[PDB]
Design a protein around this ligand. Sequence first.
Ligand SMILES: [Mg+2]
Ligand SMILES: [Mg+2]
Lengths: 128, 128
Amino acid sequence: NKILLVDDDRELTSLLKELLEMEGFNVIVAHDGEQALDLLDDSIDLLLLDVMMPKKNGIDTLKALRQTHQTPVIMLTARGSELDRVLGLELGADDYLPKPFNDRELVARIRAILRRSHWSEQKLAAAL
Amino acid sequence: NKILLVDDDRELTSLLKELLEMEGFNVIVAHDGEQALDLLDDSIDLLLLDVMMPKKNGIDTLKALRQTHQTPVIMLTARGSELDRVLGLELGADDYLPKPFNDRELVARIRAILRRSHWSEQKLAAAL
Ligand SMILES: [Mg+2]
Ligand SMILES: [Mg+2]
């Protein structure tokens, strides 16, 4: 399972890349929305998307990717108000996890949406 | 879209039934884990599941339903610790929203998982 980490905080992306790699994931990192959309392809199983970033913020990245991709996305951002959360979810995100977060909850939410993805694939392969 | 509302609090289930009905959902109510499993069938698109309930708690209900059903479930409970959240998600829940909650966020999270369900169905019908 391949995760695209989109966050402009290099310290967090390095910590998360190591964590998710320890958890058995293939991780690719984008540092803005522009980079993200350039790296986004069919091989990506999930996006961990930050909101406030230079060049193209996460809200605009999500709006753009959702025009062509149904790829699962989890917003992982310091923007944690009820408004921020409802906006992310309504714009196309499958989950929304504010910062600061617990690593165990992040992994559990990654696994929750990837379990749903696998069930969808199994049902599709069963029907085919 | 049919929602199965599993909670022992009659005051909350009545408030939520009205809210979700105003939002265009068909709502059926269970007051414990035993009638939740009795009411659970293929017509149910999502479960709003409480934890602390008599006869059968939400954790045991989730474990039981997940043996036979892949139906989307959102834990809606006063059990909001990191442990509670990670446990719910690892046991089979698609989302976990602690109490007290914001009605707008609940609806947004219901819509986020039902949008994923519809995309899965559209892809399945497209492949068929
Ligand atoms: Mg940032
Ligand atoms: Mg209760």
